[PDB]
RNA sequence: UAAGGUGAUAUGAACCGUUAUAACCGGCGAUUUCCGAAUGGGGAAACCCAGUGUGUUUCGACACACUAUCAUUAACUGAAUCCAUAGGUUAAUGAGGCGAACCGGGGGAACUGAAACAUCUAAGUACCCCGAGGAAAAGAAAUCAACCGAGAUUCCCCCAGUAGCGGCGAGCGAACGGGGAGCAGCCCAGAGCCUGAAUCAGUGUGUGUGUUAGUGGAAGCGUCUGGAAAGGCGCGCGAUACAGGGUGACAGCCCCGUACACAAAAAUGCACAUGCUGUGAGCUCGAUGAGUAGGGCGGGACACGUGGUAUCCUGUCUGAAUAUGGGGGGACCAUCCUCCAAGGCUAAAUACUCCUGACUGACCGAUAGUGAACCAGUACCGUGAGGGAAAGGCGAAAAGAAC
RNA sequence: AGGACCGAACCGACUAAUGUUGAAAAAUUAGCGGAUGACUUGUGGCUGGGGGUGAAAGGCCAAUCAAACCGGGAGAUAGCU
RNA sequence: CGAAGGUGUGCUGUGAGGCAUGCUGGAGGUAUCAGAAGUGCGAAUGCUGACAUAAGUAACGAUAAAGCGGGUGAAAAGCCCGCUCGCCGGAAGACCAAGGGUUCCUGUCCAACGUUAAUCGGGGCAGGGUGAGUCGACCCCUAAGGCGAGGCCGAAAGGCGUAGUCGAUGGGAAACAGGUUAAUAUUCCUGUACUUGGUGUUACUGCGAAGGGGGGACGGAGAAGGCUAUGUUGGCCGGGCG
RNA sequence: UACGGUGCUGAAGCAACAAAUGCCCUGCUUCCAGGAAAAGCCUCUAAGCAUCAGGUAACAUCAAAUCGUACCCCAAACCG
């Protein structure tokens, strides 16, 4: 199994947008922001076990960071991970 | 590499002059042999690679006494 | 609370490890993240507190 | 340590306000201080469309030298300069003229 | 008309990145030469 | 140490603290992802893939540790072959890589000068490579000197641009001897007597001092100009403190400091003292470094270019005497003097500054001084090695311009 | 069948004109040669400086070649300007 | 009660120069007599910065080509919408690899960038966006070639190379149709599938290699035959009768 | 119908012919210039293990991680 304090610093943020918001009200889906190094198994058992609900299964990208600038400085970013949690048909967050 | 084992024998460097003193880069080189070498204490030869007065050594000292110094100084044989 | 840590046993730090993780530390990365949280000072010292558990059950731990 | 200090009412030694008592408001890293009512600059600010739009022109107090000012005697009634000393094992600030712990 | 810098990244490492510099005396030498000049970016990794 | 703080651009928000568990400074600890000698295998650096063992009251998956090569030592195994060696496996210890200069050693140019150029010069320089230390190297006479003597090595000033070497051209260039800095001698080749006897090395402890935070630290007011006073004028005070910096113009007395006097729970450097361990004093007798010295041939180093050339080093071929002996004393012989090679250790004077602190400059002041006063080895250029900028200053205070 | 024939892609580059402070530090337009072969092309690899490679021109080796580029000796030397 | 500096005027010395003073400036300057020099620039096809000149001149980057109405706007030849016109259509369409690296999509701004204007943009700012057992990489295996324990060799650095270990551009398991987002889709959703391993049960049972064999395993050209993608025509179905 | 579209419903959905440079075809014929390797895959056993382990078949169950995925890509995004 995994280690709860492993699985406490997994998930990081709920991710708020559209695409976010259309996959929670129509496709069982919360979209959420993970830990870089998280793996899929970490996320689904992180989310059964932080929110107790039951998971169906997790698909992860990771995005990429953005070149900004202040001034004339540049500077980009930061990747980070997101991962669609796919719940079951018993769900409420 | 051109080293005797018993004397420790390198080349080393030098000149080509010639009748107009032109100097030139030389190496003179040992006259290195491999040579094998029974030892009457161990009952086996002991193959070196020796230069030609490596041997005058090794017949003047033994070849015992200079296997006890390539064993002293870690030349290994 | 420094001394306070340092008078339990091994389970008990591990208990209040997992407390300050668990009750603490995720609860208010999400209510931090999620438009809540006025409070944000409670984040630093909650991550500290953590800090000071994780020492003394090092220092406490053999050596 | 710092002689002049957070509750302490000053005078004020140097410019604009030579002579003027105050009590000294806060006290910044800089070698500054903030002493009330003492060096009043007329700032003007905007009505920032965020939470409250005082706009106008806001009369502030500056931030004067700490070497401007001194603490009020109010024993003689003049400027006086401070000393340290220790009284059972406390570092006290204490007058020099008079030799008074504050 | 085809010029003469035809980018490919696997023959930039493979080349000059920084596994083949330490991988003998004379890109070694050159790493302490960029990192004694200090510099922002040794080899040309990514 | 402390009444204020949560590093900067950079304000905010949310808070912590005010007589002590805010913050800041120091000693010792803890944590210390991944890459990099990178070391479990690999690799396009910061990534991919493991094996082995221990443990995991959901042990269908996790967590931790170990696993590189080489050298040395030991153990267990182990061929052709009988014994045995090679080899194999495991364990213990050490190494590996980086770094500015100084140091020793292995290699080693050419442009240039000679008004051409080849000997020569440049120059054993540049550069490449190996190794080591806080210094290294050298060093305790087979050394000079000269019929008197000196007494290891190293460095400085003379000697002396001298004697000499030199297509006797260009150039190279000593020693003897003198004056100083510093000064230190020892051990093995070997037995007996005798033992821990000086000696250092490794450690404990105690004392002294220094470093890493700090503490106290004198003495001024009035008036005029002025936006502002430290300035002018008038009258006082400090000084083992008038070094310096800041403060609204130029301050001994406003602030920080300076002179001076103190301070360490802890970790340390140095110097004494002392405990233990290791180590060996001292006496008598003996020995007193062989493919070596020397030689022939080739080359190199000596200021010395083979010359009449001593001396040292050795690639090659040889080859003694061994204290009634041998080396040197500038071809060489004799006489005389001096010294004991073929084993080794050794402080100080000496060379250097990546780095830290304090201080100083008839050094620079933004086209100067570092390439770089400013987020500069950056932007940018180049496949790459590499090349490589420009750019400081509102005000005393943002009071940086409400409307 | 063919280092066969005609001819697109594809490789090339014979002529002319334009361009020549270009649209382009070698091209455009109109014609032109090869086009199953000693062809052409993608991806990777190997050869290095008195060296490579060369169906040979002193060609090519990063818009550089009768000896690359970078750094150093180095402020070479310059009876010349 | 105003320094240096800057800019005028007046006086003065044979000259380089000196002195006084108005205005700007806003804090430093320095006699005399000595001392030291990065001590005086018009030239070096000098170096750096600034600014002229030609000159409001050539040009504004394929001779595929535009016209009008409406909208937004402070402003429309260029933006958005519509109707016409022209151009490419073995490409000037579509999908990738390499390479780039957010240029993608939405809102917002017009300083600079765009050889003009710009409300527009691959520009500025902010937010969003990349979903895999089956695609590709990683992975298993290897070619050329690299590296290479030992090893042979070499003044040192290092050369070569055995075992091995890496190295695709090659060999090795498996997913298709339809729908959806402003922006992803063989990845999400719907439907229908397939592949390879682990573990467990049950039935039968000889399993077992850095070893043997097969297979993988592979040339140029040519020739037809059988098909399909795809297209054309008829039938059918819906619509039109201009 | 925020006129941008958004939902609902939805007929026929066949045949003939032509036909690739794609597929059968890593085939067939022929020609000299004589045309990768190694693993997966299938088999054979050796040492060993032999009423165990393993192999095969069926069924069930679990797993399939990680990284890429936007966008241009004959081009205003790559090299110039």
């Known amino acids: 199994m995994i280690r709860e304090e492993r699985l406490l610093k997994v998930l990081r943020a709920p991710h708020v947008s559209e695409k976010a918001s259309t996959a929670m009200e129509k496709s069982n889906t919360i979209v959420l922001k993970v830990a870089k190094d998280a793996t899929k198994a970490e996320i689904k058992a992180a989310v059964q076990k932080l929110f107790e609900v039951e998971v169906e299964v997790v698909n992860t990208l990771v995005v990429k960071g953005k070149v900004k600038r202040h001034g004339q400085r540049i500077g980009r970013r930061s990747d980070w991970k997101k991962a669609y949690v796919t719940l079951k048909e018993g769900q409420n967050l | 590499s051109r080293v005797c084992q018993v004397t420790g024998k390198r080349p080393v460097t030098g000149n080509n002059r010639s009748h107009a003193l032109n100097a030139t880069k030389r190496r003179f080189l040992p006259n290195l042999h491999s040579h094998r070498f029974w030892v009457e204490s161990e ?35 | ?57 090092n220092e406490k731990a053999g050596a | 340590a710092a002689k002049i ?98 | 008309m085809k010029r003469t810098f035809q980018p490919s990244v696997l023959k930039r490492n493979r080349s000059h990145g920084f596994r083949a510099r330490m991988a003998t005396k004379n890109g070694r030498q050159v790493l302490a030469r960029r990192r004694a000049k200090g510099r922002a970016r040794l080899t040309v990794s990514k």
């Open chain 3, 1 to 57: 609370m420094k001394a306070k840590e340092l008078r339990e046993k091994s389970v008990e730090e591990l208990n209040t490890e997992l407390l300050n993780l668990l009750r603490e530390q995720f609860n208010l990365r999400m209510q931090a993240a999620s438009g809540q949280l006025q409070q944000s000072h409670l984040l630093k010292q909650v991550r500290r507190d953590v800090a000071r558990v994780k020492t003394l059950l």
């Open chain 4, 5 to 102: 200090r957070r509750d302490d009412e000053v005078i004020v030694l140097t410019g604009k306000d030579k002579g003027k008592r105050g009590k000294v408001k806060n006290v910044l890293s800089s070698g500054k201080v903030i002493v009330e009512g003492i060096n009043l600059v007329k700032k003007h600010q905007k009505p920032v469309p965020a939470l409250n739009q005082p706009g106008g022109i806001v009369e502030k107090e500056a931030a004067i030298q700490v070497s401007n000012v001194a603490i009020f005697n109010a024993a003689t009634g003049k400027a006086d300069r401070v000393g340290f000393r220790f009284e059972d094992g406390k570092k006290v600030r204490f007058f020099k003229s008079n030799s008074e712990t504050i």
């Open chain 2, 43 to 77: 009952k086996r030869f002991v193959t070196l690679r020796v230069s030609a007065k490596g041997m005058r050594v090794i017949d003047k000292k033994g070849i015992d006494t200079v296997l006890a110094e390539l064993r002293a100084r870690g030349e290994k044989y």
